[PDB]
């Protein structure tokens, strides 16, 4: 079943689930809002002519001290949540944008289910689908997690992104198969 916000609170309190740092008002009817962090990554368009899955891609990364960041029209940017999340083996969580955000043409393209056992901040794929730039304010609620129960024995997440911090560039080129 999808977990109610209240159930999410209970599980946090009992440490079945960790989401930190967190304010109680981030808890929603059946989701929890997460916030935009100060750290960003973009593909280095001056150095790379083509994007590849078979080798590392050069990129620029930075932490801003400003209150906002600008995302220009039709531009893609990697960001991160302030929150570090730790899921036990029997939960998964669907990351999605907040409706208020998507309605301004900011698409959280990374929308998907977090592997049970995942431990880290959440890397976000931001796309400005408008013809105008968007000013993103750091620390504002940008996306949310919807939790669901997993049935059966679980082999927990042991992949590339365990313990990730910051907007974390793809490591697709490490695929063993």
């Amino acid at each position: 079943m999808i977990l109610s916000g209240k159930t999410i609170s209970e599980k946090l309190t009992e440490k079945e689930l960790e989401i930190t740092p967190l304010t109680e008002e981030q808890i929603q009817p059946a989701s929890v809002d997460l916030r935009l962090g100060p750290h960003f990554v973009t593909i280095d368009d001056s150095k790379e002519a083509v994007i590849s899955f078979e080798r590392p891609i050069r990129y620029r990364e930075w932490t801003t001290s400003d209150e906002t960041i600008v995302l220009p029209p039709h531009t893609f940017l990697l960001a991160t949540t302030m929150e570090t999340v730790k899921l036990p083996n029997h939960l998964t969580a669907f990351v999605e944008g907040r409706s208020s955000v998507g309605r301004l043409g900011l698409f959280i393209q990374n929308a998907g289910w977090v592997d049970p056992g995942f431990n880290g901040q959440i890397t976000l794929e931001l796309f400005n689908a408008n013809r105008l730039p968007i000013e993103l304010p750091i620390g504002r609620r940008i996306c949310q997690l919807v939790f669901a129960e997993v049935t059966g024995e679980v082999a927990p997440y042991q992949g590339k992104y365990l313990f990730q911090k910051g907007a974390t560039m793809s490591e697709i080129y490490k695929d063993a198969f």
Copy 2:
């Protein structure tokens, strides 16, 4: 998790859930198709240079009497469902495009879970990802809802978009934090 189409039909007939107006053939194996309404909103590019999360953004809104609307290439547009949806406290619903629509490069970017207790029409985020314009026919099935049960005590949706009608502009600037 997920309610079968038949279960959705039952819950509708017993008024546990409301979706209206509705034809029986909108009911699918484990989803229900919703239709594109005549009402649209776009950002007022003659008055705004930059999109902000901290104040209202001016916009143009209109209802068309034409059978179709044209969405030009690489353009983003807010739309709405014809259907008004009312969810009880123990159900949530995932909005997503229909595969037939996404395959023509029309992306329903607003894909996500509706808060338990939500009551209103659904605002859609349309993006034409082609280099050609798309003719969207009004009243055609454009997206669908996938229903899931919620476990635990629920504080129902009391947010910005309760009772929304029409394509409804973002009210992100009303965030308390």
Copy 3:
């Protein structure tokens, strides 16, 4: 509930669910990775001026023998999984991109729930959101399925895309009502 990877394995071995061809390492904590096939479809820009929901749209389709394909910047392309999937009536599956892929600006826009009873390859909606072209390697893991149980009686999928093979163009023009 969402099925664990182990549960997915069991159901495969007992033929409750079919996904073929498949390597055991495609199985993940609570999902299964699928691979990019060699077959592609693009809208025929030399023959169509406008995209329509009301008639067939001309397109070019091809199978590549090359190891990679190039998707130019801000371009949308239809692709397919290598895997054929057959779902019984009591399961549904959420298709989504792999985080490693989305982080390079390749969006799997078709993200959504597969109808119970669906039988076919999965057609993917690829969008390159970067300013650089992307080289997609054929046969690499590109997306994944997250399985969920369906509660209640099910009328199985009897729609347009039963038995689909290859990147399969939209048949939206076949809608009744």
